Design an enzyme around this catalytic site. Structure first.
Site, PDB file in Angstrom:
ATOM      1  N   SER A 203       0.824  -1.210   0.000  1.00  0.00           N
ATOM      2  CA  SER A 203       0.000   0.000   0.000  1.00  0.00           C
ATOM      3  C   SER A 203       0.865   1.270   0.000  1.00  0.00           C
ATOM      4  O   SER A 203       1.582   1.499  -0.964  1.00  0.00           O
ATOM      5  CB  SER A 203      -0.996  -0.097   1.151  1.00  0.00           C
ATOM      6  OG  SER A 203      -2.018   0.858   0.883  1.00  0.00           O
ATOM      7  N   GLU A 327      -9.097  -5.071  -4.292  1.00  0.00           N
ATOM      8  CA  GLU A 327      -8.401  -3.934  -3.711  1.00  0.00           C
ATOM      9  C   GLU A 327      -9.371  -2.955  -3.051  1.00  0.00           C
ATOM     10  O   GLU A 327      -9.077  -2.414  -1.986  1.00  0.00           O
ATOM     11  CB  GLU A 327      -7.556  -3.223  -4.778  1.00  0.00           C
ATOM     12  CG  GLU A 327      -6.387  -4.044  -5.291  1.00  0.00           C
ATOM     13  CD  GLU A 327      -5.260  -4.140  -4.269  1.00  0.00           C
ATOM     14  OE1 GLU A 327      -5.331  -3.432  -3.250  1.00  0.00           O
ATOM     15  OE2 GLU A 327      -4.298  -4.905  -4.487  1.00  0.00           O
ATOM     16  N   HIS A 440      -7.741  -5.847   0.313  1.00  0.00           N
ATOM     17  CA  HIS A 440      -6.484  -5.137   0.364  1.00  0.00           C
ATOM     18  C   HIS A 440      -5.791  -5.383   1.700  1.00  0.00           C
ATOM     19  O   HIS A 440      -6.408  -5.287   2.750  1.00  0.00           O
ATOM     20  CB  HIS A 440      -6.800  -3.653   0.173  1.00  0.00           C
ATOM     21  CG  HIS A 440      -5.610  -2.757   0.204  1.00  0.00           C
ATOM     22  ND1 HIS A 440      -4.821  -2.532  -0.902  1.00  0.00           N
ATOM     23  CD2 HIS A 440      -5.100  -1.987   1.195  1.00  0.00           C
ATOM     24  CE1 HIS A 440      -3.864  -1.674  -0.590  1.00  0.00           C
ATOM     25  NE2 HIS A 440      -4.010  -1.327   0.676  1.00  0.00           N
TER      26      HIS A 440
END
Ligand SMILES: *[C@@H]1O[C@H](CO)[C@@H](O)[C@H](O)[C@H]1NC(C)=O
Ligand SMILES: *[C@@H]1O[C@H](CO)[C@@H](O)[C@H](O)[C@H]1NC(C)=O
EC number: 3.1.1.7
Length: 531
Positions: A203, A327, A440
């Site tokens: 990330s 995601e 995610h």
């Protein structure tokens, strides 16, 4: 000294350390936790670039994690493991510039390739001490030397009055760079090879890695790079100097405050007061947007990441990049009405249109209609399940999957060796709802080999899976090739656009990373927004 474990005593540039013998499933590892690498960025040093840690006297005890950098603490679902696992697990403090090292036990005889982890958390949260970043498994099973550092997040790490002396911006990234330098000078003491250093992160950690690639002074500090679900390009990872300045002065106002005086007032504020207003400076109602991120300062970042990747020479670069299957799902419960972890989150067409404005907060009316047009299923325009999932895809594609697609493509076109993946296995232990799919952040526990810890209740197949991924990552760190000298993982290329699926099934090769939809985001949308 004397009656201590001789194999846990180590000297580094700043002084002497005592580490700890840790138990891993298959044997012991050496850990050296909470090694200071910078002078505490406190008091008059708040907002300032880090200065290297001054040597200490005696044996610094390096057997426990140090403070977590001062940050926002999540409250959306109090008590729920799905959110709590990412929350600070040590005391919050501005004095938090420490790093961690895991190595085999006894330490390696020959110079071992080093993995350096950079955590994500939107540049506003995170910590190297979280359970999902536990280096004992990579150290024990693959013989890796693993290093992870704390770096300043939020205002402390990224509040900027571009041009000023007292708040230049990007100091969180400089914290990272200082720790990469520390590894160059000191990692050989632990048996690590300074000439084989691979960055990896997820990330915002991934974006951080990307920025080190794009910043020359970091370049000499590492050799290979992994970017998991994040990029330096894209809509959230950076802000312009103007926007940074605007957010900084707004936040100053909110807490009651010539750059020098403004900054000096900010330095008098309790850390918690800055945190209490940090979410109040965003330009629009949004998700996947963070108030204080790396700024395009024309220094650390000579130009926008888009410009830098579009035109850079990356011949010497080997990169591994990829995404998880869903995601976007995670982010929807943090501000899109109709979404919850506690129900199916089936939504209406109205909620979808509203979700799009919040998900693409910078879009004009026309651009947003384009988005809704593209993602609508015109055979079932009103179906609440499709709409739920399409809302997810919008957020995932705009923020992660397509910025990753652009990065891989530009990097490959320009000399880099690129490997690309999509992670599609959902932890049997996941505590988020099924509708969120493979959300995610949820590959990380597999890359670090948590399923090898029998008390964590993963499946035997998950254990084997984790071992495979550990092999890919450490092979790539070792050689710049995930493959073991079993189906093969081909490089990603402009001409073939190949990537692999990562799941319980053997590697399967696919072509085109959302090629069609990403053309919309990456090629058309930019042109549309003007205007
Ligand atoms: C699920 O929860 C959200 C937030 O509480 C709510 O707005 C929504 O109506 C719920 N979904 C359904 C269909 O019950
Ligand atoms: C694993 O399984 C056992 C037996 O059901 C349970 O008591 C234990 O709390 C579980 N641990 C976790 C973290 O799931």
């Amino acid at each position: 000294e004397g009656r201590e474990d001789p194999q846990l005593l180590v000297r580094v540039r700043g002084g002497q350390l005592r580490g700890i013998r840790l138990k891993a499933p298959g044997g012991p590892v050496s850990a050296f936790l909470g090694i200071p690498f910078a002078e505490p960025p406190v008091g008059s040093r708040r907002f300032m670039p880090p200065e290297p840690k001054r040597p200490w006297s005696g044996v610094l005890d390096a057997t426990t994690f140090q403070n977590v950098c001062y940050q926002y603490v999540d409250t959306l679902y109090p008590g729920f493991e799905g959110t709590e696992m990412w929350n600070p697990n040590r005391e919050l403090s501005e004095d938090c510039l420490y790093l961690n090292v895991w190595t085999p036990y006894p330490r390696p005889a020959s110079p071992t390739p080093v993995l350096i982890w950079i955590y994500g958390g939107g540049f506003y949260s995170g910590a190297a001490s979280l359970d999902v970043y536990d280096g004992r498994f990579l150290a024990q099973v693959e013989g890796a030397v693993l290093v992870s550092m704390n770096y300043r997040v939020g205002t402390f790490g990224f509040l900027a009055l571009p041009g000023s002396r007292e708040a230049p911006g990007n100091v969180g990234l400089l914290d990272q760079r200082l720790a990469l330098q520390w590894v160059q000078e000191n990692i050989a003491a632990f048996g690590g090879d300074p000439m084989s250093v691979t960055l990896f992160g997820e990330s915002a950690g991934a974006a951080s890695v990307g920025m080190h690639i794009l910043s020359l002074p970091s370049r000499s500090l590492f050799h290979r790079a992994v970017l998991q679900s994040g990029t330096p390009n894209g809509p959230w990872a950076t802000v312009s100097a103007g926007e940074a300045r605007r957010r900084a002065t707004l936040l100053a106002r909110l807490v009651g405050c010539n750059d020098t005086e403004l900054i000096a007032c900010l330095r008098t504020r309790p850390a918690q007061d800055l945190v209490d207003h940090e979410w109040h400076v965003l330009p629009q109602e949004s998700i996947f947007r963070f108030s204080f991120v790396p700024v395009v300062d024309g220094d650390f970042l000579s130009d926008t990441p888009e410009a830098l990747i579009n035109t850079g020479d990356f011949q010497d670069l080997q990169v591994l990049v990829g995404v998880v299957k869903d995601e976007g799902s995670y982010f929807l419960v943090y501000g899109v009405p109709g979404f919850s972890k506690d129900n199916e989150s089936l939504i209406s067409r109205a909620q979808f249109l509203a979700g799009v404005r919040i998900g693409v907060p910078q879009a004009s009316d026309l651009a947003a209609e384009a988005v809704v047009l593209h993602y609508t299923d015109w055979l079932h325009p009103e179906d609440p399940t499709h709409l739920r999932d399409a809302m997810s895809a919008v957020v995932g594609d705009h923020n992660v999957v397509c910025p990753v697609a652009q990065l891989a493509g530009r990097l490959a076109a320009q000399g880099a060796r690129v490997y690309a993946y999509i992670f599609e296995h959902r932890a049997s232990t996941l505590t988020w709802p099924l509708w969120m799919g493979v959300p995610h952040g949820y590959e990380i526990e597999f890359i670090f080999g948590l399923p090898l810890d029998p008390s964590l209740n993963y499946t035997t197949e998950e254990r084997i899976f984790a071992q495979r991924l550990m092999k890919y990552w450490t092979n790539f760190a070792r050689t710049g090739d995930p493959n073991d000298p079993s189906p093969q993982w081909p490089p990603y290329t402009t001409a073939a656009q190949q990537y692999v699926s990562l799941n319980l099934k053997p590697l399967e090769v696919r072509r085109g990373l959302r090629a069609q939809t990403c053309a919309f985001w990456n090629r058309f949308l930019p042109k549309l927004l003007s205007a």
